[PDB]
Design a protein around this nucleic acid. Sequence first.
RNA 1: ACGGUCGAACUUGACUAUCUAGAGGAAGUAAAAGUCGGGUUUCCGUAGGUGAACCUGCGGAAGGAUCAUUAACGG
RNA 2: CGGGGAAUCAGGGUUCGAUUCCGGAGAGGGAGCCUGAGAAACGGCUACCACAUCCAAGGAAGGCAGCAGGCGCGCAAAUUACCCACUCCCGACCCGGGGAGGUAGUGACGAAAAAUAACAAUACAGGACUCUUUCGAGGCCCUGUAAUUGGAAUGAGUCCACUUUAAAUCCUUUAACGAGGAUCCAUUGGAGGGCAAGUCUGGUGCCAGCAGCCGCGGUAAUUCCAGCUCCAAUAGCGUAUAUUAAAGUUGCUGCAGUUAAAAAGCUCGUAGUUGGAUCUCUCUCGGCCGAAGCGUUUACUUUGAAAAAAUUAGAGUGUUCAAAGCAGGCCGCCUGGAUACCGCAGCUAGGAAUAAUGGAAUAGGACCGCGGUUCUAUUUUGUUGGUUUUCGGAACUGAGGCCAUGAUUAAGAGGGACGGCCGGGGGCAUUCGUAUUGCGCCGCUAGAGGUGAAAUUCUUGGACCGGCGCAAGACGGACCAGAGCGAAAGCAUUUGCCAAGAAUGUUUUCAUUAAUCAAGAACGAAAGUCGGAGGUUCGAAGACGAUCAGAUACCGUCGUAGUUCCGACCAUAAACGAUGCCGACCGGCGAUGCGGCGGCGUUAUUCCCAUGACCCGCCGGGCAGCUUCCGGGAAACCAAAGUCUUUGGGUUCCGGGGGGAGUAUGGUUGCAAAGCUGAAACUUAAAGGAAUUGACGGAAGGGCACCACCAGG
Lengths: 28, 141, 149, 129
Amino acid sequence: ELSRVDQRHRASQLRKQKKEAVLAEKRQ
Amino acid sequence: GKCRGLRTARKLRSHRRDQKWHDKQYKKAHLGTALKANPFGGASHAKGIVLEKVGVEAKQPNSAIRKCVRVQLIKNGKKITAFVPNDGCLNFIEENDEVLVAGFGRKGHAVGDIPGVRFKVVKVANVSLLALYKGKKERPR
Amino acid sequence: GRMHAPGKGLSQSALPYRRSVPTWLKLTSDDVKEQIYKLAKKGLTPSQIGVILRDSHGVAQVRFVTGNKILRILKSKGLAPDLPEDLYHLIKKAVAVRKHLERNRKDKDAKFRLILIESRIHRLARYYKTKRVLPPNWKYESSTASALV
Amino acid sequence: VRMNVLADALKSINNAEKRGKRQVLIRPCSKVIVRFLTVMMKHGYIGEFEIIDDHRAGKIVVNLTGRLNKCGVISPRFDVQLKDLEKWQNNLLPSRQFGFIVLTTSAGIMDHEEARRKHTGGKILGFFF
RNA sequence: ACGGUCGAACUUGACUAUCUAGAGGAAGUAAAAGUCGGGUUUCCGUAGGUGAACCUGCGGAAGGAUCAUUAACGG
RNA sequence: CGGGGAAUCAGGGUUCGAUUCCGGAGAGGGAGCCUGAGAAACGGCUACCACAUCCAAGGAAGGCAGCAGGCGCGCAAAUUACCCACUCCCGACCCGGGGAGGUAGUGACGAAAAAUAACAAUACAGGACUCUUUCGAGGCCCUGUAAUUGGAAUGAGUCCACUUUAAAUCCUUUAACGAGGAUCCAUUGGAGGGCAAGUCUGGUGCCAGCAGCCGCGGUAAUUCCAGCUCCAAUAGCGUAUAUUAAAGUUGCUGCAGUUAAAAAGCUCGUAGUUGGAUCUCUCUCGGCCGAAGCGUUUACUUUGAAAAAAUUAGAGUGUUCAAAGCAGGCCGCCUGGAUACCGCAGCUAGGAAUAAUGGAAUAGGACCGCGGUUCUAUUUUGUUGGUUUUCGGAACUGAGGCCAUGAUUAAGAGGGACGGCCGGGGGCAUUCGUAUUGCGCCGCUAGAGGUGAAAUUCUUGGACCGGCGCAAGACGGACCAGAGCGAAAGCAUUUGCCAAGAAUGUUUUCAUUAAUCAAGAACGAAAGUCGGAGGUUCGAAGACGAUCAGAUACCGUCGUAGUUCCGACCAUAAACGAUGCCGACCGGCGAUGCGGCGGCGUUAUUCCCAUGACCCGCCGGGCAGCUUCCGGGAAACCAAAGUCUUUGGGUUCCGGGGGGAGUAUGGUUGCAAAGCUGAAACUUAAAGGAAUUGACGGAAGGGCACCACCAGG
């Protein structure tokens, strides 16, 4: 994967997508 | 032979680390390419969703069909095959079920007759397969 | 064994235990020293002077008779050459091999032996620079080497 | 080339003792070799020797008594402190009753027992038993 | 309010790196009993012969199973 | 995040340390501030970026990586409890406050203690002491089966009370109740081997399954599924994973590199590492001593003082024992709360072996006195203005005396000389030899070639054959050997020229100048690639002819690149001794090559003297050989592959189960081909090395037989 800051960016992107899915499911 | 001078410390330690990289277990532990190819990601256990049930054919001298399961792990999305040990224990598993999986015992190496299985099912629907097999508990769905 | 050859030979001198001047040798230290002075004025390296003194005049060792070795006597009076004898001979040999390689281009063995001679020249030059016999700015160069001899 | 003349002398003594010989010629000689043989002689291990005094580095002919099993050098000459002499005598010596680490200290070349008596440390030279 | 300073951040192109939908192509797999059907002892390196293998050329190895003869030579 | 430290460990080591103590950093991310002694502070402010709350739509308010708690995340982690009583902290303060901290709740993380029953009598059963030839006879203990009995002791629990505490709970102390096996009932794994404990019975039948590994299961399963029994640990025991020891399978201690994985094709060479002997305390100031310089400086070694506590080790001490703790003990007293270790670096004072380093060789070298030039003395010229007070101190200098004046010796280390040789070592020119091919002429003939047979092909325009010549390119046979030379690749016709080189000989010279070498650099068979020349033979490709159920490799004829030379590239081989280099030691023998030495003799037709060829020895370096129970080794074997658990001479490269794979990618070199460097996913229980027997030979020899044949009935 390399490039520590880019690995952290990937982790932040996955966090954002999973949290968006969670909030979409819970509000219904 | 070896250098044995009183000033040969850095030669000795540099040659030691360079030839340390030629050790297979050391290179597995420290290069970091096996840890990212490992589906568990440095975890003792993982939890996944049953995709399908598989009959895996046993290797050449033994004739049996081992009941395994194709599971997709929740935390990374990778697909693994896990063996369901005891007899009739595949019947406790349904499709799209929540399953706790561990390794099978040889640290990522396939074991025994089963070709290409490194994992075994430990828990099904958050109850253990041992308690289901011995009939101590009941399974929800 | 050898520096640049596979040989391991034993050809060398063996001085006797006896350091005293033999009783038949009726030569004082001053006569031997003036003989060394006139042989150097004729023009000879200390190896040649020692060989002439040993063969003809019966002087077994100069430093057993005079107490001092030949090159130190020459340096003390002042007839020592500026470059040492062995370095001079090595540079002369290198010049001859360079002349041969200029004449003959396809001679690979001459190139190899020239490389060995240059390695020996550089080793001697480093040793003489450590002992302050040569100046520290001295260097052997490919083009201007025959001028030194 | 020839490095560590003590190693050559001790190896020659060991090889000719293992062969059953009575005398050993070792060349060259040195003060360290003579001191080592003097220490090894005072414990009744080797016998008595002559230094052939040529005008070069001398030679030594040493008589052999059949009391020697192994005489050996340690290269390099490691620094040994008194706190660390016990580990060295555990590593090199066959028993606590016999065997000798020879070491050079500022009080001279001696054994490990005399080094303990005089409370000194130094650099290791050898061992014999 | 002009000016200076520290400076978050914003816009435009390049170098990128990551996340995330995709018409299509090339595949393989499970389902069709459907249709048609002699040579080599063992090698090495290079080159050619359709890629590899294999064969041949050139140069190398044995990591391949030595029987028999050998005293005269002077006039 | 770093340390203190932790796990493991013979010794050396490996791994962990987010985590309560010390230090740092930060409060969603960056940035800028105010106040203040102290902040670039976030339970302060102001922005932007990202989130997100209330809206009446104008506006307003945010920051749990504090304590609880929630969502999310996950294999993975507790109550929205009580108190400021203890420990301390803040304030104007004996008084107030503290989700710091304390106390309970959850808690099989982990550690310490410790139940699940003991005994007596009988019935069998053993093993002992006494008496008996023995059998046996007893009073001596022990053991369980007790489908046998018997009362005694109890903690679990139930639960008054006291004690504990801020209030409680718990623990402790105690009334009362609380024990006969259908109970107050102990589990988790296993029973083929490793590895302790069943060839038990029933079921299944290569299925289901078990099995870390080897394996079990296809109808007598010691291995599956059960019953019984047995085994291990036991309030605990499995399984997955990280790690440590096993692992002398990372080897410093302490591994390997002939044949098992492995030494570079070869040499040079810088950094690095290593490097032969040798050399046995005092002058001035102050009270025999203290101050001043030391002494070339170190490395080393010993000592001293600095190295937080906790933790580790360890002293004392009956927490009922222990893990713990720092307390306690004696009738107001007596006390403890030690000590050790704490790398390396930095101080400090002794020792001077070992290992570096230095002091005098154009002598502007030490020790003394004899003088000059220049700059200076801070006091003695009572008070002075002074040209001068004197004295004494620093640097540049000229001779003199004095020192036993001053250079370890010359490595069975090295370099360089000089000597007579020696060799297929190299380069250039030159000379010769045959063979082959082509051509010309002459002679006679119908075949010649090729194959296991043929065929293709040449051929009476006259092939093949024999003779006389000419030319072209190639190659240097036999001599030619376990001979020689070279760093290796390699090197063989004559002569000449050119520079090299080993060895030997030397009472020559220099005097450590050396060994092994990352980086770097020359050379490097064959094949191959660029330019030119030339192409005799041979010849990859290619074209034909044969050969067969299916032949497309073999075989024969022709033949292109090439094979040859010159100049550029390439850097690869079973580039081999499948064996790094330098140095030392440990058995023997005689052949050979070169050099040297000592010789009685034969020969150059007896040679007039040396010199060449032989003959006998000796020495040095070589190519090799034989022999040996030197020692090693898994062995075959090896005088090295020996001097290795009795393990350390110096140093370079280099291997770590078999494959993927010397592959992908990247870099670099090359015109190209490719060379150098060089993985991973994945797969596998083996692959390999040495030896040892010989089913079976489509291997070979013999013998026997009308249940074999031959001649027959």
